[PDB]
Symmetry: C2
Subunit: 390 residues, 2 copies
């Protein structure tokens, strides 16, 4: 025999370098305030699934059917495919199922798929709000085969019903990638694109708080579409990750998850209030979801500057361009902030308001070491009061 | 306190439905003999990494994987980010090819296939004919049911003669390559890819490796991987799996893999079965059942009744559909992992011949099943 004994076979016994790195990553997740809008803390049940012997399975079916059934129940889809390894892979399945090389696609942005297809962008104005009349004119002008909804840095709510009308008016597909807001949709606090788009994709981590992976959903499609989508996905699925998806999707149906998402939305609003009250500009002047963009043009700061300074105080954000950004995309004039992770670890309005205030202290004094050190200390204290896995 | 994040309530407590399905799979892995050539049993250290908080990360960990991949394979470039072998391959294509380019491969882009004969041996002269006539931008080496050695040096000569890239997908033999007991493509290819879970016995995932290129090439390969983020928990799994593969015991393992495959081959041949190519030089082989009036699908099902798992596979010039086939593909990595040596695999191969000789003899099926279960019980995978 040659049994692999779990008590004798662990990382700390065998691979000290890896173990030290893993320990330091747990410490980082605990003692940093994570405001990257795509970040979250998955449950220990998701982690248990991902650590399981399902990694050995070549593809089982019951585990997969639970994920599929739960995806359909949660989002009200008549079709779900839980196999994609990532949101990007889900998206690529959709493109290859429905598009030909060199087709025109209308996407949205701030004012490889780009290499294979002709992507025309609808750019949100300095107003920071979608203008559906203008979107309809771009659609009419360019006659895309597909309009793609979903954008990583929009703080407004997208009217998917209206987008479907625009798509239909020119015979295009509406594809919505809801990766950036899926958890809010799952909770009923943001509108669902499943009844309006021809196909929908998402990641399962981010606001859904599950494992990293993809999902394709649809409602009202024909057998033929569903068949094409299935065939475009692959090269088998990660069954341990699919188990992760199954348990995450059930967690998403808990009343606690609805309360959590309501808190996510309140928290993002409370942070916006502070930034505005401290003299910072927020794109659109508000948020209606979990995230927002701080426009630093009037401060003569770059997003890269802001991000580095905040990082020195154990606050993680990402840079992001603003509408008609006067700076290059490598630099930007904005940062994007979201509440899911801090909310997940127990921060409510008081904490996020205090945090926003500290961020304003940093940005007001971006090369003052003492401010940075003071704020770092406060961040560490707040992190201790609100531990993650406890 | 965060009710959803505290460790109190595990999957069994929370989601009995899911837990039951997970634990059935666990018991299935113990109670069946697995001869699907792409399957293995990864270590508990790999699973521990996959179960870690690294799933929440949006880099010392990645460097460890990169360094260990380069060391194991003798490469001066590695990318450990791909989610799968397929994504690794896709990265290479999108890095080096333009849409509609011509490509040559074994069994978006104009593909010219090269087809090994009934002899079950690669015809380098036919490969050369196709390459030199059609002038592909890239020749792709590596194929899933091939039991022979491949002359990677010769493929590079062919590629070099027409100015083409040589890409080798070594997924189907990577662990043997790593242990030095199968020809190494890394010195000869422009770029190589692999999965991390079959003969490497690691997590499911992809890898890109290369040597002898400049940073410009390596930058292109990096840029091509995500056309989002890596799975850092899986990458930690890769790091520890790659370290395990550097142990002298891993080479011993692969030597036993190769020896066991040859041993099973000898039984099939001696029992009147035909083996594509007449033998093996690696961990797998293909039985050609045409002369038995058997389909691969039916052979797969018959063996499954006795708790022996194989997969159907087309043979050269298969008279049957690809969904039916006239062959089965058998590999030794998983049985060897759980401790089978030559004596055990020889006995196993005899039982398989007993079933296939008389698929409808339920007495034989039941006899073999009981022996299979006894054998599985004394070779537990995990404890």
């Amino acid at each position: 025999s040659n049994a692999m004994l779990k008590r004798e076979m662990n990382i700390a016994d065998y691979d000290a370098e890896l173990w030290q790195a893993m320990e330091q990553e747990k410490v980082r997740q605990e003692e940093h305030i994570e405001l990257i809008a795509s970040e979250n803390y998955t449950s220990p049940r998701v982690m248990q699934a991902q650590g399981s012997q399902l990694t050995n399975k070549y593809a089982v079916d019951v585990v997969e059917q639970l994920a599929i059934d739960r995806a359909k129940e949660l989002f009200g889809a008549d079709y779900a495919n839980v196999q994609p390894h990532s949101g990007s892979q889900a998206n690529f399945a959709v493109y290859t199922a429905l598009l030909q090389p060199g087709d025109t696609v209308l996407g949205m942005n701030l004012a490889f798929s780009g290499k294979l297809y002709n992507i025309v962008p609808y750019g949100i104005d300095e107003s920071g709000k979608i203008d559906y009349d203008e979107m309809a004119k771009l659609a009419k002008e360019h006659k895309p085969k597909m309009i793609i909804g979903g954008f990583s840095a929009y703080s407004g709510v997208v009217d998917w019903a209206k987008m479907r009308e625009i798509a239909d008016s020119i015979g295009a597909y509406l594809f919505v990638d809801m990766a950036h807001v899926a958890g809010l949709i799952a909770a009923g606090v943001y509108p669902n694109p499943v009844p309006h788009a021809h196909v929908v994709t998402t990641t399962t981590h981010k606001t859904l708080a599950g494992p990293r992976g993809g999902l394709i959903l649809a409602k009202g499609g024909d057998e033929e579409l569903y068949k094409k989508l299935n065939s475009a996905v692959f090269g088998g699925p990660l069954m341990h990750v699919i188990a992760g998806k199954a348990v995450a999707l059930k967690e998403a149906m808990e009343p606690e998850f609805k309360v959590y998402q309501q808190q996510v939305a309140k928290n993002a609003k409370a942070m916006v209030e502070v930034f505005l009250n401290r003299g910072y500009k927020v794109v659109s002047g508000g948020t209606e979801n979990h995230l927002f963009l701080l426009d630093l043009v009037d401060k003569n700061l770059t997003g890269k500057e802001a991000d580095a300074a905040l990082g020195r105080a154990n606050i993680t954000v990402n840079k992001n361009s603003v509408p008609n950004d006067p700076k290059s995309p490598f630099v930007t004039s904005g940062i994007r902030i979201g509440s899911p992770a801090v909310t997940r670890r127990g921060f409510k309005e008081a904490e996020v308001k205090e945090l926003a205030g500290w961020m304003c202290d940093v940005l007001d004094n971006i090369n003052d070491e003492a401010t940075i050190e003071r704020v770092k200390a406060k961040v560490l204290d707040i992190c201790a009061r609100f531990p993650v896995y406890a």
